[PDB]
């Protein structure tokens, strides 16, 4: 007997909702972590409310990460030790509210959706999200230990990968979102520039051939993601 | 940053 156990589940997805509307991203996350934890698969449509809702926590957290990072290097090179140890101490904190909230993501995809996740198109979208908040650890974690973090993500995305490749056209936008952040990965994290453009190069072209195929709306979600595939291509190259 | 990943 579960009608309550149902009905808290509803209530948390329409706070999510009700969160995502009134751009409240953290209650978001909050209410879709609540959501997760009732055991039931996600729609499509909860899954997109679980990943903006994460994405947006995690985007404020690196976003400041970078810049708290980027003003800390500057202040090894001066010797500016006067307003030196406050920058690096609100730096450590910020980036251990970020490894926190990517643990908590993480926690989620291993314990609750990857396994309980019923057809491919979903199979793909969780272990690509394994995939990037490994990433946003790696982009903070040095050493030994950001390696064994790329051995993760990596291993994650070439899972989604390969059931990609089986089971969605290329012009797939989750197919083509997955191939741009592995692609990203390469080059930014794991220091594989090489694949990182073979693999940018191959999504756009293999993309590109199959636009004339589609619907409007299709090719608008397929063209956007091509034009963020070949702008990282001018980037790169 | 000027690379960019899904926007989702």
Same mark, same amino acid.
């Given at each position: 007997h579960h009608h309550h156990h149902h009905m808290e589940r509803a209530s948390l997805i329409q706070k999510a909702?009700?969160?995502?509307?009134?751009?409240?991203?953290?209650?978001? %996350? =909050? #209410?879709?972590?609540?959501?997760?934890?009732? *055991?039931?698969?996600?729609?499509?449509?909860?899954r997109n409310l679980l990943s903006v809702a994460y994405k947006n926590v995690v985007g404020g957290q690196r976003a400041a990460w970078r810049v708290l990072s980027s003003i800390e290097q500057k202040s090894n090179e001066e010797g500016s030790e006067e307003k030196?140890?406050?920058?690096?101490?609100?730096?450590?904190?910020?980036?251990?509210?970020?490894?926190?909230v990517?643990?908590?993501?993480? *926690?989620?995809?291993?314990?609750?959706?990857? &396994?309980?996740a019923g057809d491919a198109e979903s199979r793909v979208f969780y272990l690509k999200m394994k995939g990037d908040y490994y990433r946003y650890?790696?982009? $903070? %974690?040095?050493?030994?230990?950001?390696?064994?973090?790329?051995?993760?993500?990596?291993?994650?995305?070439?899972? =989604?990968?390969?059931?990609? &490749?089986?089971?969605?056209?290329?012009?797939?936008?989750?197919?083509?979102?997955? %191939?741009?952040? #592995?692609? $990203? #990965?390469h080059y930014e994290i794991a220091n594989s520039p090489e694949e990182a453009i073979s693999l940018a190069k191959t999504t756009f072209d293999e993309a590109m051939a199959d636009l004339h195929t589609l619907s409007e709306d299709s090719y608008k979600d397929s063209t956007l993601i091509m034009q963020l595939l070949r702008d990282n291509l001018t980037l790169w190259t | 940053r000027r690379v960019r990943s899904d926007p989702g």
């Open positions: 909702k009700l969160a995502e509307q009134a751009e409240r991203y953290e209650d978001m %996350a =909050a #209410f879709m972590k609540g959501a997760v934890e009732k *055991g039931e698969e996600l729609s499509c449509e909860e030196g140890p406050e920058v690096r101490e609100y730096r450590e904190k910020v980036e251990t509210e970020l490894q926190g990517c643990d908590t993501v993480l *926690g989620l995809l291993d314990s609750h959706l990857i &396994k309980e650890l790696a982009e $903070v %974690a040095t050493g030994d230990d950001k390696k064994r973090i790329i051995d993760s993500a990596r291993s994650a995305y070439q899972e =989604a990968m390969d059931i990609s &490749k089986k089971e969605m056209p290329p012009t797939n936008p989750i197919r083509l979102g997955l %191939a741009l952040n #592995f692609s $990203v #990965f | -």
